[PDB]
Amino acid sequence: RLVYTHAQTPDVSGVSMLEKIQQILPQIAKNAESAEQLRRVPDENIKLLKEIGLHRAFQPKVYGGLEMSLPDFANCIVTLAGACAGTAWAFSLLCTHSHQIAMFSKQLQDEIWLKDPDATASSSIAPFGKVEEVEGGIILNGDYGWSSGCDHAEYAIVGFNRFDADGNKIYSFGVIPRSDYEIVDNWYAQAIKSSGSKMLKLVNVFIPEYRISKAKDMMEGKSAGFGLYPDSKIFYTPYRPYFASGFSAVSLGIAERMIEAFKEKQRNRVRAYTGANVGLATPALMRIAESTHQVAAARALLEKTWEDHRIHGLNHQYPNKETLAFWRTNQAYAVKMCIEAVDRLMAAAGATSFMDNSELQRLFRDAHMTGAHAYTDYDVCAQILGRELMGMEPDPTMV
Amino acid sequence: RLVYTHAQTPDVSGVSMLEKIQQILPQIAKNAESAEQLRRVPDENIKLLKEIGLHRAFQPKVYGGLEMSLPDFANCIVTLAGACAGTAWAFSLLCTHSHQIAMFSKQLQDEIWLKDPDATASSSIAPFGKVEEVEGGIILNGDYGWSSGCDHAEYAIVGFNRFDADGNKIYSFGVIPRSDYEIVDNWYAQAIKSSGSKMLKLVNVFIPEYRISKAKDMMEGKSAGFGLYPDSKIFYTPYRPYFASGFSAVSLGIAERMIEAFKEKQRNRVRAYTGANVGLATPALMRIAESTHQVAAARALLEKTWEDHRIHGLNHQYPNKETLAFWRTNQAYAVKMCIEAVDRLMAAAGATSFMDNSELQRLFRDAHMTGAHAYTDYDVCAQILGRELMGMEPDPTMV
Amino acid sequence: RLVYTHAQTPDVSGVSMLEKIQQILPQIAKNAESAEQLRRVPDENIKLLKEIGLHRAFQPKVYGGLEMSLPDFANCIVTLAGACAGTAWAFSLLCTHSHQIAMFSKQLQDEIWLKDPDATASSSIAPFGKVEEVEGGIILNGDYGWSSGCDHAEYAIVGFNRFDADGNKIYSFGVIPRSDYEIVDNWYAQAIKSSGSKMLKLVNVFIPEYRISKAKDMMEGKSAGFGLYPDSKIFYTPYRPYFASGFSAVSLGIAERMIEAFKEKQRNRVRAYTGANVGLATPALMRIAESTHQVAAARALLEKTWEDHRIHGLNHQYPNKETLAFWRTNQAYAVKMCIEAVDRLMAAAGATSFMDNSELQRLFRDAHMTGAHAYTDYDVCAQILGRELMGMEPDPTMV
Amino acid sequence: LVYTHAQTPDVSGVSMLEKIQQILPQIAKNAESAEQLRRVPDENIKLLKEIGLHRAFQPKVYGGLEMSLPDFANCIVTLAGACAGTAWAFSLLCTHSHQIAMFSKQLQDEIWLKDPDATASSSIAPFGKVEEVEGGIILNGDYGWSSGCDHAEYAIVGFNRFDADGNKIYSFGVIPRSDYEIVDNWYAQAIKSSGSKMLKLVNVFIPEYRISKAKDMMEGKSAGFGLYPDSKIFYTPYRPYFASGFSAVSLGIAERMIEAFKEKQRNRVRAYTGANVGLATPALMRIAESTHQVAAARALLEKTWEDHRIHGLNHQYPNKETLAFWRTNQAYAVKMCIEAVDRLMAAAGATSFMDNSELQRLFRDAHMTGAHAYTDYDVCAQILGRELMGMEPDPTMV
């Protein structure tokens, strides 16, 4: 039988990563309230997740990595997000950054992972930094905000624009060690508080050429690390769809948890005005069903999209324009469905659900935040897909 | 690569049913306007569809049937509905009735198919008929409305209640020959006009016991025809999910066609008031994208659900309560999504789209009709699933 | 006490126009089915409406006109649209055209109304005609589509572009007699069938200068007829808001009728599947309530907007940019709300509601058509208002 | 008319609305510290009492204004744009006086001859345990969510008494500040500054003259009926005035959200592309649609408030149909306002969920307006639906 409401556990030999996630999930769930107040992922959470080996999901096998398929990894992030969304969001990125690093030069990867096989990077990819072309690389200055999981990373991936002969932008990534930047704690947010999305301060940071890759090169299989792992089912693919895969996975996990949490609270629900047991009233049952249907359809869309990624990576096949537009945008539609499904239940949840002692309130805020990321903006994604479907050239105003 | 916007053609070393449908589709599409005025499926349509052998999709192999999987059949109905929704709706039922008949006694099946291997049944399943218990069977009287494809069927399946010991209802089906009823032409409708959903008039019709099956028996593998086809991947399953599988397939096919038709009309769209080319304006592009996403998610949900049916039938496994509730209700949610996606485009289509000479108007009306069937009522389906998810007993008020 | 669900009848010594409409409404309602098949307003309808004097709503008092306030007239069109939407739509335009004509020269008005005080115009305002500048006027050629009520009008108002000393478009209107054009019957539509929105064929039609007005002049109180009626509470105002006021009035009336019709059908609704009396089930009651609230809010917004028009006309005050944008766009938002409210009920109405013998089907089609007019396109209206609210220059691409 | 906010009343001298507008920047600047304080700042209460808003529904004999419902509601709308919790708590401190005006002259004298500026907070859900003693009752219970309770001198408390038959008699008791403890358990994610703390009642004696039946105050049968024969506001059901502030707050949040979103949008740049994007088409259309939606919500509310005003003027108690509309229209308006807020929050970007953004506060507060028992739209849809279909009321909800 298939499962509509959550992930089917893989029927491989031994314990799958998903089962290991499920074993530690109650611990992650119990830490969620203090994680929220800590404004970063608790050390225990990172320790438990690294212990099961999730961080090595997209690390090359030569360094002791797993090279998990996208569907399998994404389902782990979904399940994790049900316990603590900020943990799942931050940890997802710590994981997906390794997929990117695997496309940099062998020398950078050796430098990161021969030293420390458990080392991860955080990131801040919006090109706000100022770049000076020196010889053998660049000097970078800037405040690099919203680096989820940055307190727990040994490196950071940082986005910047370099310039052509002509003066056209060359969007590039640089990998820098923890010692090259200061983490400034300005993370005071109303959602995914435990993600620890603090700012990275870069003062005259020298980045050597071998630690810089063009974004377009990593979209098109033209970076320094292309061809390093000829048996890989995951590295012969655009970087960005893997990088950003966790945002919608977190959204799905929140939404699936919201349904469960709402069902739990509903059973014993009484009317304050009349004293009537009201948990199983028709309007509430129909909201539960419709939100179940809506997130089941979101899950189905995501599962089909992840499978498409998996197939492309297996065949070492870079996607055409049409599938790329779907890969870019489907996840944003899924996020939009998940927020609707969460909102349909929050609207019927009563005043007690906005109290600090209610989980619903946390799920509600975190869900809305999944739709607030630049990559999940659906107005942008609708225009991207719409233009592609109509055979128009991409709008450079968005990406 | 996977396909988000329509069906992937089955990858075989032969011509699949889907490919054969695609070959005849332009003929079906060109007949759609006269089909609409005829208020029944044109003879040419039936001839073309029977010629490729689609009617034998769920007929047992012993009688020359195909025993198609549900996913493969449903995709044929989706594709067909893009050309003519009424044809797809009526023909789908002519096909799915054979799956039901395969659960009746060998004697009835022999009687239908040894005589004529190409014989089909239409139906009218709402138990409005009056039943007299005589010996060796019943006498049935009643007007049996909305029998799609009835002009083209040699038999009819008719629903009626028989009665306990206790005064309880026993919902039953009777298969009767064309000679036992009159087709009264009262089919004057505003959607799926070409379905020919005319009424069957039954005057003192004697139905012998061997041509009567209990509905519950055909839900639970307890009917006279159970175990007849031990190698079958499709008959060891509840009848109703196959019977009613075409409603949402038609809805999906209309919605996928609506997107294409809207895109075609949009390219050259000029503003009457200002004289400016407006086809590629941002609002229209975003509607196109969102309706594309919405029906892609509906397709994904349906494909997952059909796969679940296929797997259950393969294993001869009757579904548990939870999956049954999903099978019953997922299709209604998908219909609801498809109508939303159609409506999003119709709202932006302009006054010319409500003219008789526009296809959009036909797609719009036919789409809304798919949500109007008793089986696709989403209020009913939300209550059914909601109650099941909350561990409540089924509401006998609906089914 | 106030009324949320329909119009309050004006308290005046004497029978108000609204009461007179209410008296003849059952006759209009009973003619609706044959009106639909006739594809134009039945002679009896025109006769009844002219008998109560509604056509003289916006005709100057000097010619025997009423000079009704916009709110009072709009409520008559709302009530009328509950009986027959096509009649209300066509007749509304026959009425509002007189407001426009009142801004042309005294000579044209004398020519129309001294001859025949009961004479009306239809229109086709999209500037598709080809214009030759001759002396003393123009020669116009073109097919002028969608002229609602044209079979019953003695004149037509026709839109065309003239050109500047410098080649800039001068959007203009010409009033021509019935003898100058052929009505071509190409009116085959799926909504407001009884509007008789046939095409006007113009072959080398000479229009003298005194029968031509600039649109901008009639927006800004600069046309030949400005200042003719110094005591008027209605003529010192932009022409367009009155011209186009009937589209949303018709939408409101359809929506208010749909609620009533749905309530009537619901009372006795039995389940075909089970036999239970289901008319008063919770989901249906909530749809009834929400559609009641939604159209009450639409009515409230329209009433406030009509009052704003009434006040401006009373004071002879031409609206500023902000109020003009609201006048232009509020009606389109109201139409959008009314269609949502109709759709919420149609979705729960069952298969019998799509039969030709059901009124719901007619209300459903006609409602959607109200959202299909160029003036009620909400994508256009959202951009118009949005740009104004943000202090941006108007987009010439729309109007 | 004005579509986007209230028209200021044209009177000689200053209207209450103008006075609200004068103090609004002070209320707005206090909103962040009000949020952290988890109650209305003393300065806010002082400013609002100084302009005399608390005396809106107090009888004229005690120095009250007897404001019309529309005029009062528009003051709460405007106030909610600056601080939603302040508006929400203060609205209730104001509307309670309308209720108190239906109690006995003796209770009113006792409250207002003593202190003309005295107000009540409330907790109306009948969770308390009642002992019938003689000359009144003894009440025990935890009475949660009493907005503005730190600033009130009295509390109105809801409880069930019983019939000869054992039937529920839903009643209200007015008790002094000295008879209860304010327990600070107010830790919420919206309207934080409302200070909706709990009232602890331990063996509180309430004398009969301080108890009124809810139904009596719905039907003009309470002890205070007929006390103010010239009043344009007291010959009316209590509950529609009591609960009028919830939707007023929702409207004010929504109208502010539009303004705040417009302000942030002007200079908006894409992080990934560095393009000025504030005036892009999708954002303009969201601004317009949210403007239309809250304009229609305002129009519906204004019409409903006018209907209340007219009924009160004529001393006319509403029939069943208008009562159902009065009960439910405000909940539909709240639902529209939240949609309008959500349409803008969905396009607002990640910076809008930071603590230093106002949008985040408006978003949370808006959703909370839809979370009150009186604004539950599922309940309201059933109430209206049943009435429209000629069915008897469902006792399961009210």
Curated annotation (Swiss-Prot), chain D:
Transmembrane segments: none
Domain of life: Bacteria
InterPro entries per the UniProt record, alphabetical: Acyl-CoA_dehydrogenase, Acyl-CoA_DH_C, Acyl-CoA_Oxase/DH_mid-dom_sf, AcylCo_DH-like_C, AcylCoA_DH/ox_N, AcylCoA_DH/ox_N_sf, AcylCoA_DH/oxidase_NM_dom_sf
Entry binding sites for FMN: W88, S122, S123, I124, W145, S146, S147, R268, Y272, A350, T351, H372, A373
GO biological process, one term: fatty acid beta-oxidation using acyl-CoA dehydrogenase
EC number(s) on file: 1.14.14.9
Disulfide bridges in this chain: none
Catalytic activity: 4-hydroxyphenylacetate + FMNH2 + O2 = 3,4-dihydroxyphenylacetate + FMN + H2O + H(+); 4-hydroxyphenylacetate + FADH2 + O2 = 3,4-dihydroxyphenylacetate + FAD + H2O + H(+)
Entry GO terms, CC: cytoplasm
Assembly with partners or alone: Homotetramer. The p-hydroxyphenylacetate 3-hydroxylase (HpaH) is composed of an oxygenase component C2 and a reductase component C1.
The name this protein goes by in its record: p-hydroxyphenylacetate 3-hydroxylase, oxygenase component
Species, as recorded: Acinetobacter baumannii
